Short mmCIF file of C-alpha atoms and ligand atoms in Angstrom, two decimals:
data_model
loop_
_atom_site.label_atom_id
_atom_site.label_comp_id
_atom_site.label_asym_id
_atom_site.label_seq_id
_atom_site.Cartn_x
_atom_site.Cartn_y
_atom_site.Cartn_z
CA UNK A 1 8.78 -2.22 14.92
CA UNK A 2 10.91 -1.03 12.05
CA UNK A 3 8.89 1.78 10.49
CA UNK A 4 5.62 1.08 12.27
CA UNK A 5 4.25 1.83 15.71
CA UNK A 6 1.04 0.63 17.39
CA UNK A 7 -1.62 3.06 16.23
CA UNK A 8 -4.92 1.27 16.95
CA UNK A 9 -6.96 3.89 18.86
CA UNK A 10 -8.22 1.36 21.39
CA UNK A 11 -4.71 0.14 22.24
CA UNK A 12 -3.78 3.77 22.90
CA UNK A 13 -6.66 3.93 25.43
CA UNK A 14 -5.90 0.58 27.08
CA UNK A 15 -4.71 0.30 30.66
CA UNK A 16 -3.98 4.00 31.31
CA UNK A 17 -5.65 4.01 34.73
CA UNK A 18 -7.16 1.59 37.30
CA UNK A 19 -10.54 0.18 36.23
CA UNK A 20 -12.28 -2.21 33.86
CA UNK A 21 -12.30 -1.94 30.08
CA UNK A 22 -14.33 -4.18 27.78
CA UNK A 23 -14.21 -4.52 24.00
CA UNK A 24 -16.17 -6.78 21.67
CA UNK A 25 -14.70 -8.43 18.60
CA UNK A 26 -16.66 -7.11 15.63
CA UNK A 27 -15.65 -8.24 12.12
CA UNK A 28 -11.91 -8.55 12.88
CA UNK A 29 -11.77 -5.31 14.90
CA UNK A 30 -11.73 -4.52 18.62
CA UNK A 31 -14.74 -2.28 19.41
CA UNK A 32 -15.43 -0.71 22.80
CA UNK A 33 -18.54 -1.84 24.67
CA UNK A 34 -20.68 1.09 25.95
CA UNK A 35 -19.94 1.31 29.70
CA UNK A 36 -23.64 1.03 30.59
CA UNK A 37 -23.65 -2.42 28.93
CA UNK A 38 -20.71 -3.84 30.91
CA UNK A 39 -21.48 -7.32 32.20
CA UNK A 40 -24.17 -8.08 29.58
CA UNK A 41 -22.47 -10.57 27.26
CA UNK A 42 -23.87 -11.76 23.91
CA UNK A 43 -23.45 -15.57 23.84
CA UNK A 44 -22.87 -15.31 20.07
CA UNK A 45 -19.80 -13.07 20.51
CA UNK A 46 -16.25 -12.88 21.87
CA UNK A 47 -14.94 -10.10 24.08
CA UNK A 48 -11.63 -8.82 25.48
CA UNK A 49 -11.63 -7.54 29.08
CA UNK A 50 -8.76 -5.63 30.68
CA UNK A 51 -8.74 -5.19 34.46
CA UNK A 52 -6.20 -2.57 35.56
CA UNK A 53 -5.26 -2.31 39.26
CA UNK A 54 -2.92 0.24 40.87
CA UNK A 55 0.06 -1.23 42.70
CA UNK A 56 1.93 0.24 45.69
CA UNK A 57 4.65 2.09 43.70
CA UNK A 58 2.03 3.42 41.36
CA UNK A 59 2.68 1.02 38.49
CA UNK A 60 -0.29 -0.80 37.01
CA UNK A 61 -1.21 -4.50 37.25
CA UNK A 62 -3.03 -6.02 34.26
CA UNK A 63 -5.20 -9.07 33.77
CA UNK A 64 -6.48 -9.69 30.26
CA UNK A 65 -9.44 -12.00 29.88
CA UNK A 66 -10.84 -13.10 26.58
CA UNK A 67 -14.42 -14.26 26.96
CA UNK A 68 -15.84 -16.68 24.44
CA UNK A 69 -19.62 -17.11 23.99
CA UNK A 70 -21.03 -20.58 23.42
CA UNK A 71 -22.11 -19.54 19.91
CA UNK A 72 -19.31 -17.19 18.85
CA UNK A 73 -17.79 -17.93 15.45
CA UNK A 74 -14.23 -19.11 14.85
CA UNK A 75 -13.12 -15.70 13.49
CA UNK A 76 -14.35 -14.09 16.74
CA UNK A 77 -12.71 -16.50 19.22
CA UNK A 78 -9.50 -16.55 17.14
CA UNK A 79 -9.46 -12.73 16.94
CA UNK A 80 -10.16 -12.42 20.71
CA UNK A 81 -7.15 -14.68 21.42
CA UNK A 82 -4.83 -12.76 19.03
CA UNK A 83 -5.92 -9.30 20.24
CA UNK A 84 -5.18 -10.52 23.78
CA UNK A 85 -1.58 -11.42 22.79
CA UNK A 86 -1.22 -8.09 20.97
CA UNK A 87 -2.53 -6.05 23.90
CA UNK A 88 -0.21 -7.90 26.32
CA UNK A 89 2.74 -7.12 23.99
CA UNK A 90 1.65 -3.47 23.80
CA UNK A 91 1.53 -3.43 27.65
CA UNK A 92 5.18 -4.63 27.80
CA UNK A 93 4.19 -8.23 28.63
CA UNK A 94 2.84 -7.11 31.99
CA UNK A 95 -0.58 -8.77 31.62
CA UNK A 96 -1.62 -12.24 32.77
CA UNK A 97 -3.88 -13.73 30.06
CA UNK A 98 -7.03 -15.69 30.95
CA UNK A 99 -9.29 -17.71 28.64
CA UNK A 100 -12.89 -17.36 29.88
CA UNK A 101 -15.48 -19.71 28.41
CA UNK A 102 -19.21 -18.97 28.89
CA UNK A 103 -20.44 -20.93 31.93
CA UNK A 104 -16.90 -21.78 33.10
CA UNK A 105 -15.46 -18.34 33.96
CA UNK A 106 -12.93 -17.94 36.75
CA UNK A 107 -13.99 -16.56 40.14
CA UNK A 108 -11.68 -13.58 39.46
CA UNK A 109 -13.48 -12.71 36.23
CA UNK A 110 -16.97 -13.15 37.74
CA UNK A 111 -15.87 -10.88 40.62
CA UNK A 112 -15.42 -7.94 38.23
CA UNK A 113 -19.18 -7.56 37.91
CA UNK A 114 -20.57 -6.36 41.25
CA UNK A 115 -24.16 -7.35 40.43
CA UNK A 116 -23.24 -10.55 38.53
CA UNK A 117 -22.66 -10.85 34.81
CA UNK A 118 -25.58 -11.72 32.51
CA UNK A 119 -25.88 -13.70 29.26
CA UNK A 120 -28.05 -12.81 26.29
CA UNK A 121 -28.65 -14.66 23.04
CA UNK A 122 -27.39 -13.26 19.72
CA UNK A 123 -24.56 -10.94 18.68
CA UNK A 124 -22.69 -9.39 15.75
CA UNK A 125 -22.35 -11.43 12.52
CA UNK A 126 -19.17 -13.40 11.73
CA UNK A 127 -16.51 -11.67 9.64
CA UNK A 128 -16.10 -14.90 7.63
CA UNK B 1 -6.38 -3.96 0.62
CA UNK B 2 -6.81 -7.74 0.42
CA UNK B 3 -4.15 -9.93 2.09
CA UNK B 4 -3.29 -13.44 0.88
CA UNK B 5 -2.54 -16.43 3.07
CA UNK B 6 -0.33 -19.28 1.90
CA UNK B 7 0.31 -22.38 4.03
CA UNK B 8 3.30 -24.13 2.41
CA UNK B 9 2.87 -27.82 3.25
CA UNK B 10 5.39 -30.55 2.41
CA UNK B 11 2.68 -32.48 0.56
CA UNK B 12 -0.12 -29.98 -0.03
CA UNK B 13 -0.16 -26.20 -0.41
CA UNK B 14 -3.19 -24.31 0.94
CA UNK B 15 -3.66 -20.82 -0.51
CA UNK B 16 -6.37 -18.18 -0.37
CA UNK B 17 -7.64 -14.83 0.80
CA UNK B 18 -7.51 -13.42 4.33
CA UNK B 19 -11.06 -13.19 5.71
CA UNK B 20 -12.27 -16.34 3.95
CA UNK B 21 -13.05 -19.33 6.17
CA UNK B 22 -11.24 -21.79 3.85
CA UNK B 23 -8.40 -21.79 1.31
CA UNK B 24 -9.55 -21.27 -2.28
CA UNK B 25 -6.82 -23.49 -3.63
CA UNK B 26 -5.49 -26.73 -2.16
CA UNK B 27 -3.00 -28.59 -4.40
CA UNK B 28 0.09 -30.86 -4.32
CA UNK B 29 3.39 -29.08 -3.53
CA UNK B 30 4.99 -30.51 -6.68
CA UNK B 31 6.91 -29.14 -9.64
CA UNK B 32 7.14 -31.30 -12.77
CA UNK B 33 9.62 -30.89 -15.62
CA UNK B 34 10.04 -32.83 -18.90
CA UNK B 35 11.23 -36.36 -18.04
CA UNK B 36 13.53 -36.74 -21.04
CA UNK B 37 15.80 -34.21 -22.83
CA UNK B 38 5.77 -25.03 -20.97
CA UNK B 39 9.09 -25.57 -19.15
CA UNK B 40 7.39 -26.68 -15.91
CA UNK B 41 4.06 -27.65 -14.35
CA UNK B 42 2.89 -27.29 -10.75
CA UNK B 43 0.28 -28.96 -8.57
CA UNK B 44 -2.57 -31.10 -9.88
CA UNK B 45 -1.51 -30.67 -13.52
CA UNK B 46 2.05 -31.83 -12.75
CA UNK B 47 0.70 -34.87 -10.91
CA UNK B 48 -1.71 -35.73 -13.76
CA UNK B 49 1.06 -35.41 -16.38
CA UNK B 50 3.51 -37.55 -14.37
CA UNK B 51 3.81 -39.97 -17.35
CA UNK B 52 5.89 -37.34 -19.20
CA UNK B 53 7.29 -35.34 -16.26
CA UNK B 54 9.84 -35.90 -13.52
CA UNK B 55 8.34 -34.65 -10.23
CA UNK B 56 10.07 -32.74 -7.44
CA UNK B 57 8.83 -31.89 -3.96
CA UNK B 58 10.74 -28.79 -2.85
CA UNK B 59 9.54 -28.92 0.80
CA UNK B 60 10.73 -31.71 3.09
CA UNK B 61 9.67 -31.87 6.76
CA UNK B 62 8.17 -28.43 6.31
CA UNK B 63 11.55 -26.96 5.31
CA UNK B 64 12.24 -25.65 1.79
CA UNK B 65 15.11 -27.59 0.21
CA UNK B 66 15.01 -26.19 -3.33
CA UNK B 67 14.37 -22.47 -3.79
CA UNK B 68 14.13 -22.50 -7.60
CA UNK B 69 11.30 -25.04 -7.33
CA UNK B 70 9.69 -23.20 -4.39
CA UNK B 71 9.68 -20.00 -6.46
CA UNK B 72 7.88 -21.92 -9.28
CA UNK B 73 5.24 -23.07 -6.78
CA UNK B 74 4.72 -19.52 -5.52
CA UNK B 75 4.53 -18.11 -9.04
CA UNK B 76 1.87 -20.72 -9.90
CA UNK B 77 0.02 -20.06 -6.64
CA UNK B 78 -0.30 -16.32 -7.36
CA UNK B 79 -0.93 -16.35 -11.11
CA UNK B 80 -2.82 -19.61 -11.67
CA UNK B 81 -4.40 -20.73 -8.40
CA UNK B 82 -5.38 -17.37 -6.82
CA UNK B 83 -5.40 -15.37 -10.10
CA UNK B 84 -3.79 -12.32 -8.43
CA UNK B 85 -0.91 -9.99 -9.19
CA UNK B 86 1.25 -10.45 -6.06
CA UNK B 87 2.60 -6.85 -6.26
CA UNK B 88 -0.94 -5.79 -5.21
CA UNK B 89 -1.30 -7.84 -1.98
CA UNK B 90 0.27 -8.26 1.49
CA UNK B 91 1.14 -11.95 1.80
CA UNK B 92 1.14 -14.03 4.97
CA UNK B 93 3.28 -17.17 4.63
CA UNK B 94 3.63 -20.02 7.11
CA UNK B 95 6.76 -21.82 8.28
CA UNK B 96 7.68 -24.97 10.20
CA UNK B 97 8.68 -24.67 13.86
CA UNK B 98 12.46 -24.06 14.08
CA UNK B 99 12.69 -23.09 10.40
CA UNK B 100 16.40 -22.25 9.82
CA UNK B 101 17.37 -18.56 9.98
CA UNK B 102 18.75 -18.51 6.41
CA UNK B 103 15.46 -20.00 5.13
CA UNK B 104 13.30 -17.29 6.73
CA UNK B 105 15.53 -14.67 5.09
CA UNK B 106 15.38 -16.40 1.71
CA UNK B 107 11.54 -16.52 1.83
CA UNK B 108 11.51 -12.82 2.61
CA UNK B 109 14.03 -11.98 -0.15
CA UNK B 110 12.00 -13.93 -2.74
CA UNK B 111 8.67 -12.25 -1.83
CA UNK B 112 10.09 -8.72 -2.09
CA UNK B 113 12.66 -9.10 -4.90
CA UNK B 114 11.00 -11.72 -7.13
CA UNK B 115 7.29 -11.01 -6.53
CA UNK B 116 7.45 -7.37 -5.38
CA UNK B 117 4.95 -7.98 -2.60
CA UNK B 118 4.03 -4.65 -0.93
CA UNK B 119 4.20 -6.39 2.46
CA UNK B 120 4.67 -9.83 3.95
CA UNK B 121 4.71 -11.73 7.19
CA UNK B 122 5.90 -15.17 8.30
CA UNK B 123 4.03 -17.12 11.02
CA UNK B 124 4.77 -20.47 12.66
CA UNK B 125 2.21 -23.05 11.56
CA UNK B 126 1.54 -24.50 15.06
CA UNK B 127 0.95 -21.02 16.51
CA UNK B 128 -1.68 -20.24 13.81
CA UNK B 129 -3.44 -23.55 14.73
CA UNK B 130 -3.51 -22.56 18.40
CA UNK B 131 -5.02 -19.15 17.52
CA UNK B 132 -7.60 -20.88 15.26
CA UNK B 133 -8.76 -22.86 18.34
CA UNK B 134 -9.34 -19.61 20.25
CA UNK B 135 -6.40 -20.01 22.69
CA UNK B 136 -3.16 -18.22 23.54
CA UNK B 137 -1.65 -21.09 25.61
CA UNK B 138 -1.56 -24.82 24.80
CA UNK B 139 0.59 -27.46 23.19
CA UNK B 140 -0.01 -28.13 19.51
CA UNK B 141 0.58 -31.59 18.08
CA UNK B 142 0.87 -30.72 14.35
CA UNK B 143 1.10 -33.80 12.11
CA UNK B 144 1.00 -33.55 8.31
CA UNK B 145 3.08 -35.11 5.50
CA UNK B 146 6.58 -36.00 6.74
CA UNK B 147 6.93 -34.69 10.28
CA UNK B 148 4.91 -34.44 13.51
CA UNK B 149 5.77 -31.36 15.65
CA UNK B 150 4.96 -30.87 19.35
CA UNK B 151 4.96 -27.11 20.02
CA UNK B 152 4.26 -25.70 23.50
CA UNK B 153 2.98 -22.13 23.36
CA UNK B 154 2.53 -19.72 26.24
CA UNK B 155 0.59 -16.46 26.04
CA UNK B 156 0.91 -16.37 22.26
CA UNK B 157 4.55 -17.43 21.77
CA UNK B 158 6.12 -20.81 21.04
CA UNK B 159 8.71 -22.06 23.55
CA UNK B 160 11.54 -22.95 21.14
CA UNK B 161 13.62 -24.84 23.71
CA UNK B 162 10.67 -27.24 24.25
CA UNK B 163 9.69 -27.95 20.62
CA UNK B 164 10.14 -31.58 19.64
CA UNK B 165 9.53 -33.63 16.55
CA UNK B 166 8.76 -37.16 15.53
CA UNK B 167 10.03 -37.93 12.02
CA UNK B 168 6.89 -39.87 11.05
CA UNK B 169 3.69 -38.54 9.56
CA UNK B 170 1.13 -39.19 6.84
CA UNK B 171 3.41 -40.24 3.98
CA UNK B 172 4.98 -42.84 6.29
CA UNK B 173 1.53 -44.10 7.32
CA UNK B 174 0.57 -44.41 3.64
CA UNK B 175 3.78 -46.34 2.93
CA UNK B 176 3.08 -48.55 5.94
CA UNK B 177 -0.52 -49.27 4.87
CA UNK B 178 0.96 -50.23 1.45
CA UNK B 179 3.35 -52.68 3.17
CA UNK B 180 0.79 -54.32 5.47
CA UNK B 181 -1.79 -54.67 2.70
CA UNK B 182 0.79 -56.93 0.91
CA UNK B 183 0.38 -59.47 3.74
CA UNK B 184 -3.20 -59.93 2.55
CA UNK B 185 -1.94 -60.29 -1.03
CA UNK B 186 -2.81 -56.85 -2.36
CA UNK B 187 0.09 -55.28 -4.22
CA UNK B 188 -0.17 -51.50 -4.52
CA UNK B 189 3.05 -50.12 -6.00
CA UNK B 190 2.30 -47.58 -8.76
CA UNK B 191 1.33 -43.91 -8.17
CA UNK B 192 -2.40 -44.50 -8.91
CA UNK B 193 -2.20 -47.55 -6.61
CA UNK B 194 -0.55 -45.53 -3.83
CA UNK B 195 -3.44 -43.02 -4.19
CA UNK B 196 -5.85 -45.91 -3.56
CA UNK B 197 -3.87 -46.86 -0.42
CA UNK B 198 -4.03 -43.22 0.73
CA UNK B 199 -7.83 -43.29 0.18
CA UNK B 200 -8.12 -46.55 2.21
CA UNK B 201 -6.11 -44.86 4.99
CA UNK B 202 -8.26 -41.73 4.92
CA UNK B 203 -11.64 -43.55 4.70
CA UNK B 204 -11.24 -46.76 6.73
CA UNK B 205 -8.36 -46.43 9.22
CA UNK B 206 -8.89 -45.55 12.86
CA UNK B 207 -6.92 -45.40 16.08
CA UNK B 208 -7.73 -48.25 18.50
CA UNK B 209 -8.35 -47.12 22.11
CA UNK B 210 -6.76 -50.37 23.32
CA UNK B 211 -4.54 -51.75 20.57
CA UNK B 212 -3.95 -55.20 22.11
CA UNK B 213 -7.68 -55.66 22.75
CA UNK B 214 -8.42 -54.52 19.19
CA UNK B 215 -5.95 -57.09 17.76
CA UNK B 216 -7.62 -59.79 19.88
CA UNK B 217 -11.07 -58.73 18.57
CA UNK B 218 -9.79 -58.72 14.97
CA UNK B 219 -8.29 -62.23 15.36
CA UNK B 220 -11.40 -63.72 17.02
CA UNK B 221 -14.06 -62.51 14.52
CA UNK B 222 -14.82 -60.47 11.38
CA UNK B 223 -16.45 -57.67 13.39
CA UNK B 224 -13.79 -55.07 12.44
CA UNK B 225 -13.46 -56.03 8.76
CA UNK B 226 -14.53 -53.63 6.01
CA UNK B 227 -14.98 -53.85 2.25
CA UNK B 228 -13.36 -51.40 -0.13
CA UNK B 229 -14.19 -51.14 -3.83
CA UNK B 230 -11.23 -50.50 -6.14
CA UNK B 231 -11.63 -48.17 -9.19
CA UNK B 232 -11.92 -51.21 -11.52
CA UNK B 233 -14.77 -52.66 -9.43
CA UNK B 234 -12.88 -55.40 -7.54
CA UNK B 235 -13.82 -55.50 -3.83
CA UNK B 236 -11.11 -56.10 -1.22
CA UNK B 237 -11.36 -56.75 2.54
CA UNK B 238 -9.47 -54.82 5.18
CA UNK B 239 -9.14 -56.08 8.76
CA UNK B 240 -6.64 -55.17 11.47
CA UNK B 241 -4.75 -53.07 8.91
CA UNK B 242 -7.41 -50.40 9.63
CA UNK B 243 -5.96 -49.68 13.07
CA UNK B 244 -2.42 -51.11 12.70
CA UNK B 245 -1.58 -48.35 10.23
CA UNK B 246 -2.14 -45.28 12.51
CA UNK B 247 -0.92 -47.33 15.52
CA UNK B 248 2.58 -46.50 14.13
CA UNK B 249 2.07 -42.89 15.40
CA UNK B 250 2.03 -44.31 18.95
CA UNK B 251 4.45 -47.17 18.27
CA UNK B 252 7.14 -45.93 15.83
CA UNK B 253 8.87 -49.33 16.26
CA UNK B 254 6.25 -50.56 13.73
CA UNK B 255 8.34 -48.66 11.14
CA UNK B 256 11.64 -49.80 12.63
CA UNK B 257 12.08 -46.47 14.41
CA UNK B 258 13.58 -46.14 17.90
CA UNK B 259 11.73 -42.83 18.54
CA UNK B 260 9.04 -42.38 21.21
CA UNK B 261 5.43 -42.23 19.95
CA UNK B 262 3.42 -38.98 19.58
CA UNK B 263 1.93 -39.21 23.09
CA UNK B 264 5.41 -39.44 24.64
CA UNK B 265 6.75 -36.68 22.40
CA UNK B 266 3.90 -34.46 23.63
CA UNK B 267 4.65 -35.35 27.28
CA UNK B 268 8.39 -34.72 26.73
CA UNK B 269 7.76 -31.24 25.30
CA UNK B 270 5.49 -30.41 28.27
CA UNK B 271 8.19 -31.56 30.69
CA UNK B 272 10.74 -29.25 28.98
CA UNK B 273 8.59 -26.24 29.97
CA UNK B 274 8.47 -24.21 33.22
CA UNK B 275 6.64 -26.30 35.87
CA UNK B 276 4.31 -23.31 36.46
CA UNK B 277 2.81 -23.53 32.96
CA UNK B 278 2.45 -27.32 32.54
CA UNK B 279 -1.12 -27.41 33.87
CA UNK B 280 -2.15 -25.07 31.05
CA UNK B 281 -0.42 -27.25 28.43
CA UNK B 282 -2.03 -30.54 29.58
CA UNK B 283 -5.41 -28.75 29.69
CA UNK B 284 -5.01 -27.46 26.10
CA UNK B 285 -3.58 -30.14 23.81
CA UNK B 286 -4.57 -29.06 20.28
CA UNK B 287 -4.35 -31.51 17.37
CA UNK B 288 -3.62 -29.99 13.97
CA UNK B 289 -2.90 -31.35 10.45
CA UNK B 290 -4.16 -34.03 8.10
CA UNK B 291 -2.55 -36.93 9.95
CA UNK B 292 -4.50 -36.07 13.10
CA UNK B 293 -7.76 -36.82 11.18
CA UNK B 294 -8.00 -40.54 12.20
CA UNK B 295 -11.21 -41.37 14.12
CA UNK B 296 -10.27 -42.34 17.69
CA UNK B 297 -7.06 -40.29 17.83
CA UNK B 298 -8.29 -37.74 20.43
CA UNK B 299 -9.62 -40.52 22.75
CA UNK B 300 -6.28 -42.34 22.43
CA UNK B 301 -4.20 -39.18 23.08
CA UNK B 302 -6.37 -38.53 26.14
CA UNK B 303 -5.78 -42.09 27.41
CA UNK B 304 -2.01 -42.00 26.82
CA UNK B 305 -1.38 -38.53 28.26
CA UNK B 306 -3.57 -39.38 31.26
CA UNK B 307 -1.28 -42.39 31.95
CA UNK B 308 1.87 -40.24 31.71
CA UNK B 309 0.64 -37.27 33.80
CA UNK B 310 -0.16 -37.17 37.57
CA UNK B 311 -3.73 -38.43 38.16
CA UNK B 312 -4.97 -35.07 39.40
CA UNK B 313 -3.85 -33.29 36.21
CA UNK B 314 -6.76 -32.39 33.91
CA UNK B 315 -6.01 -33.57 30.35
CA UNK B 316 -7.99 -32.00 27.52
CA UNK B 317 -7.50 -32.88 23.87
CA UNK B 318 -8.94 -30.41 21.40
CA UNK B 319 -9.52 -31.94 17.98
CA UNK B 320 -11.57 -29.55 15.82
CA UNK B 321 -13.34 -31.03 12.74
CA UNK B 322 -11.61 -28.38 10.56
CA UNK B 323 -8.10 -29.33 11.82
CA UNK B 324 -6.72 -30.27 8.38
CA UNK B 325 -6.97 -26.51 7.68
CA UNK B 326 -6.44 -25.01 11.19
CA UNK B 327 -3.08 -23.46 10.21
CA UNK B 328 -4.57 -21.78 7.13
CA UNK B 329 -7.66 -20.57 9.05
CA UNK B 330 -5.49 -19.15 11.87
CA UNK B 331 -3.53 -17.25 9.16
CA UNK B 332 -6.74 -15.97 7.56
CA UNK B 333 -7.95 -14.55 10.92
CA UNK B 334 -4.54 -13.04 11.84
CA UNK B 335 -4.08 -11.36 8.42
CA UNK B 336 -7.64 -9.90 8.63
CA UNK B 337 -7.24 -8.14 12.01
CA UNK B 338 -7.38 -4.34 12.04
CA UNK B 339 -4.02 -4.47 13.87
CA UNK B 340 -2.34 -6.61 11.08
CA UNK B 341 -1.40 -3.56 9.06
CA UNK B 342 0.95 -2.53 11.86
CA UNK B 343 2.62 -6.00 11.99
CA UNK B 344 3.73 -6.81 8.48
CA UNK B 345 7.17 -6.21 6.98
CA UNK B 346 6.66 -3.45 4.34
CA UNK B 347 8.57 -3.06 1.07
CA UNK B 348 10.00 0.19 2.48
CA UNK B 349 11.30 -1.68 5.53
CA UNK B 350 12.80 -4.43 3.37
CA UNK B 351 14.51 -1.83 1.15
CA UNK B 352 16.12 -0.20 4.19
CA UNK B 353 17.00 -3.34 6.23
CA UNK B 354 17.19 -6.32 3.85
CA UNK B 355 16.04 -9.92 4.56
CA UNK B 356 17.32 -9.98 8.17
CA UNK B 357 14.38 -7.76 9.17
CA UNK B 358 12.35 -11.01 9.32
CA UNK B 359 14.03 -11.91 12.66
CA UNK B 360 12.90 -8.65 14.22
CA UNK B 361 9.34 -8.52 12.84
CA UNK B 362 8.39 -12.21 12.86
CA UNK B 363 9.05 -14.33 15.98
N1 ATP C 1 -9.12 -38.20 7.03
C1 ATP C 1 -7.80 -38.48 7.11
N2 ATP C 1 -7.30 -39.47 7.88
C2 ATP C 1 -5.99 -39.76 7.95
N3 ATP C 1 -5.04 -39.07 7.30
C3 ATP C 1 -5.42 -38.03 6.50
C4 ATP C 1 -6.83 -37.66 6.36
N4 ATP C 1 -6.92 -36.61 5.53
C5 ATP C 1 -5.65 -36.31 5.15
N5 ATP C 1 -4.78 -37.16 5.73
C6 ATP C 1 -3.33 -37.19 5.54
O1 ATP C 1 -2.75 -35.95 5.89
C7 ATP C 1 -1.51 -35.85 5.19
C8 ATP C 1 -1.39 -34.42 4.70
O2 ATP C 1 -1.52 -33.59 5.86
P1 ATP C 1 -1.30 -32.01 5.76
O3 ATP C 1 -1.99 -31.42 4.54
O4 ATP C 1 -1.63 -31.45 7.13
O5 ATP C 1 0.30 -32.03 5.51
P2 ATP C 1 1.17 -30.91 4.75
O6 ATP C 1 0.74 -29.54 5.15
O7 ATP C 1 1.18 -31.31 3.31
O8 ATP C 1 2.62 -31.28 5.34
P3 ATP C 1 3.48 -30.68 6.59
O9 ATP C 1 2.57 -29.83 7.41
O10 ATP C 1 3.95 -31.94 7.29
O11 ATP C 1 4.58 -29.89 5.90
C9 ATP C 1 -1.54 -36.86 4.05
O12 ATP C 1 -0.64 -37.94 4.37
C10 ATP C 1 -2.98 -37.34 4.05
O13 ATP C 1 -3.12 -38.67 3.52
CA1 CA C 2 -20.93 -13.21 16.71
MG1 MG C 3 1.46 -28.45 7.26
#
């Protein structure tokens, strides 16, 4: 707004076509997860997941899930929440937002991972 | 470029650097000037020199009431507390829920015109606390110095039509502890004495799960009594005052107020929101602020909200240990995000649009 426009490269990539996109919060930034690692979540980290589905008239349906590992730091869970709001705003408020806590994820979220999601210990260091 | 975060409390200012997990400087929001006939002091030094200064608190209920004094606080915060030149740093400031329009503009005008900040942003305190808890939806019960706010938030934005307030918070609880301690024969009336009462409140008070039952217990034995050593060395005994003091949050009639207690205020805010989001508010009640620090408060909120809500509604009270600083921490995270740079009001924008840009950039 005013003199500024959304320029974050990952926002520009977000929700352009039907599919699943996953980013990890890394030191106050939103970093894409390599597609071959989708579904393998570090319990020490927080992630943002965007599921894009094509509707009948060709518009896109969005569900934004922010996934919070049992051991993720406060900067990571806070950043995951804020990036979720920001991405929804960028997507014209068209996304339903979902808080996903490790071990308590919604059936919808779990259903994104055909072979079942997996947990692994560790993750990227806190930005604090 | 290093952003600053300033949480302007009515009683205490919290100031520091975005990306830090805690404010570097926490000090009284006070300006002192010569009592009779350096022109001014701020913060701890003003409080210490109170014998020769008249003290002013420019923020009341989270709202700035004296801009000359507020400007002195900000000048002190930058130059003395943080040891920065504010012309070199984006600054994130916090504001009370429902801060008047003219006040948001004045804050903005001061930052750009007085301090020449290259960029600034204004965020609602309760919203920062919600973000600090890792949530985008919930209801924040934010209770500090003079006011307790209940602020429902959905998918990152406060619902202004549903924000309520109880005009009772920590300073009133301190004053009430002072009053009830007189019943036992302990007169605390001076500033140093009031500081002792505040310490008794912060160290020994707690919220009873069942107030009536607690009063019965107190009256039937010395089980709940505690000793407190005064600075001189004298030892006093505190009994039911321990839980009667914060009971006023739930029963404002203790202070001669007709207002509903904090649990009811929270319920009332929830009921002002769209029926379709109420589940998410009950399931995400976040406590924030110094006056939410009483042991037992989360258990009591859970009990009271459970009684008000339908039995099948899941109530969850979130009461983080760091909640005295949740607002500041939420600001520190927000101001650190790679996307922040795209959100602030820039000097260039202010020069083109003037103070009213704050309503278009910050909401
Ligand atoms: N452990 C504690 N138990 C009870 N009360 C506490 C505790 N610690 C601090 N407080 C009270 O918290 C109050 C200050 O809270 P806080 O710093 O959140 O308010 P503020 O930011 O100054 O004001 P506001 O947010 O209302 O403008 C004081 O009354 C203080 O005595
Ligand atoms: Ca991590
Ligand atoms: Mg405050």
